[PDB]
């Protein structure tokens, strides 16, 4: 009955936050201000378990090994190795040449399988290795109040219903019900997707416990200030606890690459046993027992199989990981390589992922002008006038007054990623000033602060006074910050460009509009002011206190404003730019505030400039928001409230006809449903996200997309794929990368099956027309998994044949990696004729010693007779066993051999699947050496000391090595003429039929 | 006597070609 | 759906609108294909000789061959039993069948050569402007007590085993005996320069089990091919040629148990292979029980 529990897992918490204290301690049974008895602690401690989460469910054993063995495409090779296995069984009902034959093949196909599994599994093992290396957990004791007593115990000891205290700097133990606060803002970032630290009180808020101020959470550090709450909520009881335990215990889904290759798997064997069965009935209707013609069948089914295929693909995947890796991009899972490009659909978290989830210095005031900061990451942005007096002033105002200060250790580090001790909106002043202005250090010690005024509980206004650094002006400087409203009614004078004025209301609302203007695009606003004293009235060995008014609080000069926010990272926006140029739909899901969510989403580009939401439009017109057609909205920003009464149908509609889509103030639940409602659409989802509030999405999605350090453990434990530098960017390059990869695949796919039928006709027309076998065994291995390997790899780094990421993404029902049109080449046309050319070798060496091509029907069954020793060729010469045999030996290297050289033309038609060849080119250089090694491979196994001994190969006649040219320059010039006509006619018969 | 072929002669032939295709091939894989 | 598409309005499955089309090209293609392979072995069957082949150095070393060739050189029969020395009987009387008196009349075609063994008898070239070349006769008197016309065996064996060894054919082929100077050839006659020796024993160069007595029958008594049946110059310009037999007989022989017999032809054109056991030599394995 896990799947209620699942079902009570994917719907939104409830709570008792709205009581009384009276009740709530009531209720609890305990002290709000002595807690509760140590002995009724460790009572509860031990009564149901200690405060922290269960380790995560899964631990898979290293025989995790055994799901590499198998999967789908091994299977096929395990069948085969099994049909082999029982076709030399059946081989056992008389005396048997497979010892060299059959066992042979079955075991080869079992090597292949075990050997590939552990190439994978070690590839695997590695990423989860360079992934443990990065854990960390370091102990974080709590602080309790027991019996009236302040006690800091393990946070694992902390139970349900004891008094709590958290301090500025201190993680959250449990799920706390706030009784009493100072001051106190907890962030709330991860949790839920709350950008700015949201203050905690005693008071009950919102309805929802999430955006409530009397709930602090578990996980959640607090910023600044002090609380004291009773625990709700211990364990896997808590909210994030619940959020892990529902991503623990989701399914992973089938990967897009997986499928293609199963119904790959499904047009092979479909062939496979079409010929296996057709040539059964047809190997009965002439002569041969049903041992033989069950024999025949295993043989064929078994022959139409790709053994060395399995070692390319999984090579071919590794290797795009391998550049990925390169990239600081790191993929959990191998095929999870290519799912981007199938991507049509990306689901991206605000903070943390699109944006750095760090209070930033983003416009200022000076002079009635706003001007931008830089608010990248590694200021790649465009730097401010600071040539001006009024910014030299403002900046030293900010930079003077704050409680914000570098800590020990932040040299080296770059200015913005270095941490700070203080305030949010103080960390990012700090910031910015040590950044444009110079050092803040000097600067800040320059003027030495006599009294200050921190933060008031009521108007917060902060107000410090400092000595004068000037030579001119021995007077003392003070300077306030404070919100724009009510530093407007403490402030009189304006500064502008380094002289004074007083206020006129053209440009005291010129100052509220843009106040307005800033404070509605999303950003945070600070007023700041300063004033110069008259050191007549307050002399220069005067001492002034925070008792009474010493310094006139108005008529003060009013400088600027300066906002912030938390900025998208330096490589976002361009990268959504191309994620929508390449089709891809961008939603924005995140569960912050509506306000700064939509500002957040024009910024990045998922809302392009000029689209309304209906919101939009009901504003423009003055018009009731009920009024307006939904359908003249292209965008829409859908509020989390209303997510929840919303249906399958109406969710299919959202989705549907609005192409900029916002979810905001969103529980990671409803994440999860609507992935799961893009997928109701049938589309393939990518999601991307920062903290554990994605962790359900992460991992229902079809590929899912953490943040190497800014991401949480748990949503980095259920993504596929792990981005190490935390770049955007990768997000695009990964797109390309797995829509190239794809292209490829098919390339090599097509060589590796192209070979297949001039290896599987010898032995056909060997049941046919009684001829003596034209290609053994030892020579089909020696091509699957001798020679074509290297060029079927190399066939992975071909490159893009146009540009790529102006194609829309592909059609998972239409589209496929091997199709109709792909076994129609290889199969039809191009292995046919190599099929030929092979048998062509055969009759020219056969004709030279002797037996001519007509003699040589009906001949096996005398030909592989060991015992008649006279056979006559077509001079009338009499031929032993071993002597003959020899001949049908050195009649297999060189049918090898032209395998190679057929391969050849295949190996540089198969380079491309439109362009001619005189275009994309042989400027790749693994091609190159792949037709060199190939060749040089087949001449070593032909003219090797012994190997006729060893592998029954013998050394060809040099000439021999001629006979398969006209066919490769036959297969070359044909494709090379219907990659012209597919160029020049897109219509097109060439391109439905054969274009693959 | 016409019963009499040249194998080790082209055998050596074969072998120096498998030598030299593969270290030119060598040459072509690394461009510096 | 997905599958069912057999058929539907209008498609014959899997997609029947263009079947004509796609079926005409394979049609064309494959026949052009068929057309270019044809070409390709036309020409390959321009550069092949009509007289003689083109390699003829993989059975340089020609093989000792048997009459009653067996399922794994081996006779193994009961002296009593008519039924059990059947098979063997009858694959000698089809082999002998071809080399009876009467068999070959014609003065046209057959050519009558010494009744004692005689140089190598060497017929112009191997083109056609020399007509049908003649074949030299054989006739079954050269091996006595074995198939000898009417009189006697006639059970072929079916007192003592006996045995008929044949050499392989091979087109210009022209057999050189070793020298009187040869190396410790055991037993054999004066003979030696116009026939090519046969001598046999029971195990190679090592141990023997070896009980036996042999008595053989070649051309005018010699245990050999006579060259005068050399070269052999193929089937287009000797057809109905009857190369030389020679006749093996084991007499005295340990009844009820199994024991070999290797047969060599020695030679300087002639040489042997340890891989191939029948190349330039022979091996039989005989049991009559009874
Ligand atoms: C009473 C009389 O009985 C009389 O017994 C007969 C009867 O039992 C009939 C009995 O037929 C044979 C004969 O047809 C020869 C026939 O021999 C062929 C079939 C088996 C082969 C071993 C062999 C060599 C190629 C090999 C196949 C088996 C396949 O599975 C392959 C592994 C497969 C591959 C898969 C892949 O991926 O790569 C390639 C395709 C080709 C293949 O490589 C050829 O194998 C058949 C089984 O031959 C026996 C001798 C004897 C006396 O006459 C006696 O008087
Ligand atoms: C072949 O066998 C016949 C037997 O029919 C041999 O004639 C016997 O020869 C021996 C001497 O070896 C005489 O003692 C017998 O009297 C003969 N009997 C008969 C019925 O002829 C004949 O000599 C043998 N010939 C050869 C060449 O082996
Ligand atoms: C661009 C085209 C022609 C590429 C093909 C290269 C051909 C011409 C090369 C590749 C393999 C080569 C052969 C390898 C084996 C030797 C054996 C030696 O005893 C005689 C020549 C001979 C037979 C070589 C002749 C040239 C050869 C047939
Ligand atoms: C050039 C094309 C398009 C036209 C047709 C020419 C073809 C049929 C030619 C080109 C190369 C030729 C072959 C090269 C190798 C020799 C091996 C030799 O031992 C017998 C003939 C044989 C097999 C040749 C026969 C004809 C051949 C296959
Ligand atoms: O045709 C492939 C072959 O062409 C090369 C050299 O011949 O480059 C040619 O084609 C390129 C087009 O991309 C241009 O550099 C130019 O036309 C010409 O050099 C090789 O790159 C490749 O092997
Ligand atoms: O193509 C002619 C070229 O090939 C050679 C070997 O290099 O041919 C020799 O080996 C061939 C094997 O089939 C024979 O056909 C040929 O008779 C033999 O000379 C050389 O002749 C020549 O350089
Ligand atoms: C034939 O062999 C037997 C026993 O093997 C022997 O007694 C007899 O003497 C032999 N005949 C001869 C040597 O003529
Ligand atoms: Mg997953
Ligand atoms: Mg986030
Ligand atoms: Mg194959």
């Given at each position: 009955?896990?799947?209620?529990?699942?079902?009570?897992?994917?719907?939104?918490?409830?709570?008792?936050?709205?009581?009384?204290?009276?009740?709530?301690?009531?209720?609890?049974?305990?002290?709000?201000?002595?807690?509760?008895?140590?002995?009724?602690?460790?009572?509860?401690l031990?009564?149901?378990?200690?405060?922290?989460?269960?380790?995560?469910?899964?631990?898979?054993?290293?025989?995790?090994?055994?799901?590499?063995?198998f999967?789908?495409?091994?299977?096929?090779?395990?069948?085969?190795?099994?049909?082999?296995?029982?076709?030399?069984?059946?081989?056992?009902?008389?005396?048997?040449?497979?010892?060299?034959?059959?066992?042979?093949?079955?075991?080869?196909?079992?090597?292949?399988?075990?050997?590939?599994?552990?190439?994978?599994?070690?590839?695997?093992?590695?990423?989860?290795?360079?992934?443990?290396?990065?854990?960390?957990?370091?102990?974080?004791?709590?602080?309790?109040?027991?019996?009236?007593?302040?006690?800091s115990?393990?946070?694992?000891?902390?139970?349900?219903?004891?008094?709590?205290?958290?301090?500025?700097?201190?993680?959250?133990?449990?799920?706390?019900?706030?009784?009493?606060?100072?001051?106190?803002?907890?962030?709330?970032?991860?949790?839920?997707?709350?950008?700015?630290?949201?203050?905690?009180?005693?008071?009950?808020?919102?309805?929802?416990?999430?955006?409530t101020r009397?709930?602090?959470?578990?996980?959640?550090?607090?910023?600044?200030?002090?609380?004291?709450?009773?625990?709700?909520?211990?364990?896997?009881?808590?909210?994030?606890?619940r959020?892990?335990?529902?991503?623990?215990?989701?399914?992973?889904?089938?990967?897009?690459?997986?499928?293609?290759?199963?119904?790959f798997?499904?047009?092979?064997?479909?062939?496979?046993?079409?010929?296996?069965?057709?040539?059964?009935?047809?190997?009965?209707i002439?002569?041969?027992?049903?041992?033989?013609?069950?024999?025949?069948?295993?043989?064929?089914?078994?022959?139409?199989?790709?053994?060395?295929?399995?070692?390319?693909?999984?090579?071919?995947?590794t290797?795009?990981?391998?550049?990925?890796?390169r990239?600081?991009?790191?993929?959990?899972?191998?095929?999870?390589?290519?799912?981007?490009?199938?991507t049509?659909?990306?689901?991206?978290?605000?903070?943390?992922?699109?944006?750095?989830?760090?209070?930033?210095?983003?416009?200022?005031?000076?002079?009635?002008?706003?001007?931008?900061?830089?608010?990248?990451?590694?200021?790649?942005?465009?730097?401010?006038?600071?040539?001006?007096?009024?910014?030299?002033?403002?900046?030293?105002?900010?930079?003077?007054?704050?409680?914000?200060?570098?800590?020990?250790?932040?040299?080296?580090?770059?200015?913005?990623?270095?941490?700070?001790?203080?305030?949010?909106?103080?960390?990012?002043?700090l910031?910015?000033?040590?950044?444009?202005?110079?050092?803040?250090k000097?600067?800040?010690?320059?003027?030495?602060?006599?009294?200050?005024?921190?933060?008031?509980?009521?108007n917060?206004?902060?107000?410090?006074?400092?000595?004068?650094?000037?030579?001119?002006?021995?007077?003392?400087?003070?300077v306030?910050?404070?919100?724009?409203?009510?530093?407007?009614?403490?402030?009189?004078?304006?500064?502008?460009?380094?002289?004074?004025?007083?206020?006129?209301?053209?440009?005291?609302?010129?100052?509220?509009?843009?106040?307005?203007?800033?404070?509605?695009?999303?950003?945070?606003?600070?007023?700041?002011?300063?004033?110069?004293?008259?050191?007549?009235?307050?002399?220069?060995?005067?001492?002034?206190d925070?008792?009474?008014?010493?310094?006139?609080?108005?008529?003060?000069?009013?400088?600027?404003?300066?906002?912030?926010?938390?900025?998208?990272?330096?490589?976002v926006?361009?990268?959504?730019?191309?994620?929508?140029?390449?089709?891809?739909?961008?939603?924005?899901?995140?569960?912050?505030?509506?306000?700064?969510?939509?500002?957040?989403?024009?910024?990045?580009?998922?809302?392009?400039?000029?689209?309304?939401?209906?919101?939009?439009?009901?504003?423009?017109?003055?018009?009731?928001?009920?009024?307006?057609?939904?359908?003249?909205?292209?965008?829409?920003?859908?509020?989390?409230?209303?997510?929840?009464?919303?249906?399958?149908?109406?969710?299919?509609?959202?989705?549907?006809?609005?192409?900029?889509?916002?979810?905001?103030?969103?529980?990671?639940?409803?994440?999860?449903?609507?992935?799961?409602?893009?997928?109701?659409?049938?589309?393939?989802?990518?999601?991307?996200?920062?903290?554990?509030?994605?962790?359900?999405?992460?991992?229902?999605?079809?590929?899912?997309?953490?943040?190497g350090?800014?991401?949480?453990?748990?949503?980095?434990?259920?993504?596929?794929?792990?981005?190490?530098?935390?770049?955007?960017?990768?997000?695009?390059?990964?797109?390309?990368?797995?829509?190239?990869?794809?292209?490829?695949?098919?390339?090599?796919?097509?060589?590796?099956?192209?070979?297949?039928?001039?290896?599987?006709?010898?032995?056909?027309?060997?049941?046919?027309?009684?001829?003596?076998?034209?290609?053994?065994?030892?020579?089909?291995?020696?091509?699957?998994?001798?020679?074509?390997?290297?060029?079927?790899?190399?066939?992975?780094?071909?490159?893009?044949?146009?540009?790529?990421?102006?194609?829309?993404?592909?059609?998972?029902?239409?589209?496929?990696?091997?199709?109709?049109?792909?076994?129609?080449?290889?199969?039809?046309?191009?292995?046919?004729?190599?099929?030929?050319?092979?048998?062509?070798?055969?009759?020219?060496?056969?004709?030279?010693?002797?037996?001519?091509?007509?003699?040589?029907?009906?001949?096996?069954?005398?030909?592989?007779?060991?015992?008649?020793?006279?056979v006559?060729?077509?001079?009338?010469?009499?031929?032993?066993?071993?002597?003959?045999?020899?001949?049908?030996?050195?009649?297999?290297?060189?049918?090898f051999?032209?395998?190679?050289?057929?391969?050849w033309?295949?190996?540089?038609?198969?380079?491309?699947?439109?362009?001619?060849?005189?275009?994309?080119?042989?400027?790749?250089?693994?091609?190159?050496?792949?037709?060199?090694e190939?060749?040089?491979?087949?001449?070593?196994?032909?003219?090797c000391?012994?190997?006729?001994?060893?592998?029954?190969?013998?050394?060809?006649?040099?000439?021999?090595?001629?006979?398969?040219?006209?066919?490769?320059?036959?297969?070359?010039?044909?494709?090379?003429?219907?990659?012209?006509?597919?160029?020049?006619?897109?219509?097109?018969?060439?391109?439905?039929?054969?274009?693959? | 006597?016409?019963?009499?072929?040249?194998y080790?002669?082209?055998?050596?032939?074969?072998?120096?070609?498998?030598?030299?295709?593969?270290?030119?091939?060598?040459?072509?894989?690394?461009?510096? | 759906?997905?599958?069912?598409?057999?058929?539907?309005?209008?498609?014959?499955?899997?997609?029947?609108?263009?079947?004509?089309?796609?079926?005409?090209?394979?049609?064309?293609?494959?026949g052009?294909?068929?057309?270019?392979?044809?070409?390709?072995?036309?020409?390959?069957?321009?550069?092949?000789?009509?007289?003689?082949?083109?390699?003829?150095?993989?059975?340089?070393?020609?093989?000792?061959?048997?009459?009653?060739?067996?399922?794994?050189?081996?006779?193994?029969?009961?002296?009593?039993?008519?039924?059990?020395?059947?098979?063997?009987?009858?694959?000698?009387?089809?082999?002998?069948?071809?080399?009876?008196?009467?068999?070959?009349?014609?003065?046209?075609?057959?050519?009558?050569?010494?009744?004692?063994?005689?140089?190598?008898?060497?017929?112009?070239?191997?083109?056609?402007?020399?007509?049908?070349?003649?074949?030299?006769?054989?006739?079954?008197?050269?091996?006595?007590?074995?198939?000898?016309?009417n009189?006697?065996?006639?059970?072929?064996?079916?007192?003592?085993?006996?045995?008929?060894?044949?050499?392989?054919?091979?087109?210009g082929?022209?057999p050189?005996?070793?020298?009187?100077?040869?190396?410790?050839?055991?037993?054999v006659?004066?003979?030696?320069?116009?026939?090519?020796?046969?001598?046999?024993?029971?195990?190679?160069?090592?141990?023997?089990?070896?009980?036996?007595?042999?008595?053989?029958?070649?051309?005018?008594?010699?245990?050999?091919?006579?060259l005068?049946?050399?070269?052999?110059?193929?089937?287009?310009?000797?057809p109905?040629?009857?190369?030389?037999?020679?006749?093996?007989?084991?007499?005295?022989?340990?009844?009820?148990?199994?024991?070999?017999?290797e047969?060599?032809?020695?030679?300087?054109?002639?040489?042997?292979?340890?891989?191939?056991?029948?190349?330039?030599?022979?091996?039989?394995?005989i049991?009559?029980?009874?």
């Open positions: 009955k896990e799947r209620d529990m699942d079902e009570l897992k994917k719907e939104v918490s409830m709570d008792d936050h709205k009581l009384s204290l009276d009740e709530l301690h009531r209720k609890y049974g305990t002290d709000l201000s002595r807690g509760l008895t140590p002995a009724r602690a460790a009572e509860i031990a009564r149901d378990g200690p405060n922290a989460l269960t380790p995560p469910p899964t631990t898979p054993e290293w025989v995790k090994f055994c799901r590499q063995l999967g789908g495409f091994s299977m096929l090779l395990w069948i085969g190795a099994i049909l082999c296995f029982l076709a030399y069984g059946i081989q056992a009902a008389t005396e048997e040449e497979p010892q060299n034959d059959n066992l042979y093949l079955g075991v080869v196909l079992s090597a292949v399988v075990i050997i590939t599994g552990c190439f994978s599994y070690y590839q695997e093992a590695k990423s989860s290795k360079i992934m443990e290396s990065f854990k960390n957990m370091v102990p974080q004791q709590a602080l309790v109040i027991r019996n009236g007593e302040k006690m115990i393990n946070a694992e000891e902390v139970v349900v219903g004891d008094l709590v205290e958290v301090k500025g700097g201190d993680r959250i133990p449990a799920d706390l019900r706030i009784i009493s606060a100072n001051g106190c803002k907890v962030d709330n970032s991860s949790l839920t997707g709350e950008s700015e630290p949201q203050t905690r009180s005693p008071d009950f808020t919102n309805e929802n416990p999430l955006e009397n709930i602090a959470f578990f996980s959640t550090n607090c910023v600044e200030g002090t609380a004291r709450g009773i625990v709700v909520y211990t364990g896997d009881r808590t909210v994030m606890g959020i892990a335990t529902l991503a623990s215990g989701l399914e992973g889904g089938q990967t897009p690459i997986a499928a293609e290759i199963e119904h798997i499904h047009i092979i064997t479909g062939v496979a046993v079409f010929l296996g069965v057709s040539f059964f009935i047809l190997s009965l002439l002569e041969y027992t049903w041992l033989e013609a069950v024999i025949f069948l295993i043989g064929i089914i078994v022959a139409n199989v790709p053994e060395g295929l399995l070692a390319t693909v999984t090579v071919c995947l290797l795009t990981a391998k550049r990925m890796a990239k600081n991009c790191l993929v959990k899972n191998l095929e999870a390589v290519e799912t981007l490009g199938s049509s659909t990306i689901c991206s978290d605000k903070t943390g992922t699109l944006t750095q989830n760090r209070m930033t210095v983003a416009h200022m005031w000076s002079d009635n002008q706003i001007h931008e900061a830089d608010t990248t990451e590694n200021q790649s942005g465009v730097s401010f006038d600071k040539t001006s007096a009024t910014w030299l002033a403002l900046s030293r105002i900010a930079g003077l007054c704050n409680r914000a200060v570098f800590q020990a250790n932040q040299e080296n580090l770059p200015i913005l990623k270095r941490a700070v001790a203080g305030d949010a909106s103080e960390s990012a002043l910031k910015c000033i040590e950044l444009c202005c110079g050092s803040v000097e600067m800040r010690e320059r003027y030495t602060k006599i009294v200050e005024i921190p933060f008031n509980s009521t917060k206004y902060q107000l410090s006074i400092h000595k004068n650094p000037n030579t001119a002006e021995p007077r003392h400087l003070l306030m910050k404070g919100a724009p409203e009510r530093i407007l009614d403490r402030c009189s004078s304006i500064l502008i460009h380094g002289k004074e004025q007083p206020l006129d209301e053209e440009l005291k609302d010129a100052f509220q509009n843009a106040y307005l203007e800033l404070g509605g695009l999303g950003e945070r606003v600070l007023g700041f002011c300063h004033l110069f004293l008259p050191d007549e009235q307050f002399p220069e060995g005067f001492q002034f925070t008792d009474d008014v010493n310094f006139p609080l108005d008529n003060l000069c009013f400088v600027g404003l300066i906002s912030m926010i938390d900025p998208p990272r330096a490589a926006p361009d990268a959504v730019g191309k994620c929508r140029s390449a089709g891809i739909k961008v939603i924005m899901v995140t569960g912050d505030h509506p306000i700064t969510a939509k500002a957040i989403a024009k910024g990045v580009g998922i809302i392009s400039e000029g689209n309304e939401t209906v919101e939009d439009i009901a504003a423009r017109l003055n018009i009731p928001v009920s009024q307006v057609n939904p359908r003249d909205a292209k965008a829409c920003v859908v509020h989390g409230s209303d997510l929840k009464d919303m249906t399958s149908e109406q969710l299919d509609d959202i989705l549907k006809y609005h192409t900029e889509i916002v979810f905001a103030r969103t529980s990671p639940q409803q994440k999860l449903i609507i992935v799961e409602g893009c997928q109701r659409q049938g589309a393939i989802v990518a999601v991307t996200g920062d903290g554990v509030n994605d962790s359900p999405a992460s991992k229902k999605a079809d590929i899912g997309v953490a943040m350090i800014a991401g949480s453990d748990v949503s980095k434990q259920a993504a596929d794929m792990i981005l190490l530098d935390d770049n955007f960017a990768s997000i695009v390059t990964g797109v390309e990368e797995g829509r190239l990869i794809f292209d490829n695949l098919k390339k090599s796919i097509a060589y590796t099956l192209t070979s297949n039928i001039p290896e599987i006709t010898p032995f056909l027309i060997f049941i046919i027309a009684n001829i003596p076998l034209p290609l053994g065994t030892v020579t089909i291995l020696c091509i699957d998994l001798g020679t074509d390997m290297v060029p079927a790899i190399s066939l992975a780094y071909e490159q893009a044949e146009s540009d790529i990421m102006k194609r829309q993404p592909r059609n998972p029902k239409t589209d496929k990696l091997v199709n109709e049109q792909l076994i129609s080449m290889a199969y039809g046309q191009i292995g046919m004729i190599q099929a030929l050319g092979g048998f062509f070798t055969y009759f020219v060496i056969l004709a030279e010693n002797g037996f001519l091509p007509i003699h040589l029907l009906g001949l096996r069954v005398n030909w592989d007779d060991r015992w008649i020793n006279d006559e060729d077509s001079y009338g010469q009499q031929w032993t066993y071993e002597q003959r045999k020899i001949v049908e030996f050195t009649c297999h290297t060189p049918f051999v032209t395998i190679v050289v057929v391969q033309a295949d190996l540089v038609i198969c380079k491309t699947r439109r362009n001619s060849v005189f275009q994309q080119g042989m400027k790749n250089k693994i091609l190159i050496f792949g037709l060199f190939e060749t040089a491979l087949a001449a070593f196994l032909s003219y000391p012994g190997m006729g001994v060893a592998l029954r190969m013998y050394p060809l006649k040099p000439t021999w090595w001629f006979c398969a040219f006209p066919y490769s320059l036959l297969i070359f010039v044909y494709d090379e003429v219907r990659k012209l006509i597919i160029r020049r006619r897109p219509g097109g018969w060439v391109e439905k039929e054969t274009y693959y | 006597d016409p019963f009499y072929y040249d080790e002669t082209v055998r050596n032939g074969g072998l120096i070609f498998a030598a030299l295709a593969f270290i030119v091939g060598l040459i072509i894989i690394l461009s510096k | 759906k997905f599958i069912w598409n057999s058929e539907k309005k209008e498609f014959l499955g899997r997609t029947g609108g263009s079947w004509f089309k796609i079926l005409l090209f394979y049609v064309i293609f494959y052009c294909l068929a057309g270019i392979f044809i070409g390709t072995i036309q020409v390959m069957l321009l550069t092949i000789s009509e007289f003689k082949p083109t390699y003829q150095d993989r059975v340089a070393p020609p093989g000792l061959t048997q009459i009653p060739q067996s399922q794994k050189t081996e006779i193994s029969f009961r002296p009593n039993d008519p039924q059990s020395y059947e098979s063997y009987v009858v694959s000698i009387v089809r082999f002998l069948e071809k080399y009876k008196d009467l068999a070959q009349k014609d003065d046209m075609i057959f050519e009558d050569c010494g009744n004692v063994p005689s140089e190598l008898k060497e017929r112009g070239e191997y083109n056609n402007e020399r007509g049908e070349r003649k074949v030299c006769r054989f006739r079954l008197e050269w091996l006595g007590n074995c198939s000898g016309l009189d006697e065996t006639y059970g072929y064996k079916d007192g003592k085993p006996c045995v008929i060894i044949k050499l392989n054919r091979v087109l082929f022209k050189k005996p070793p020298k009187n100077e040869s190396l410790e050839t055991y037993p006659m004066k003979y030696n320069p116009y026939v090519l020796p046969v001598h046999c024993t029971g195990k190679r160069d090592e141990d023997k089990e070896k009980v036996g007595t042999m008595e053989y029958f070649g051309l005018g008594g010699y245990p050999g091919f006579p005068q049946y050399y070269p052999y110059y193929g089937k287009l310009l000797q109905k040629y009857l190369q030389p037999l020679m006749a093996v007989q084991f007499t005295n022989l340990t009844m009820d148990t199994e024991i070999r017999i047969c060599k032809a020695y030679g300087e054109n002639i040489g042997y292979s340890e891989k191939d056991r029948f190349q330039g030599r022979f091996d039989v394995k049991e009559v029980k009874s």
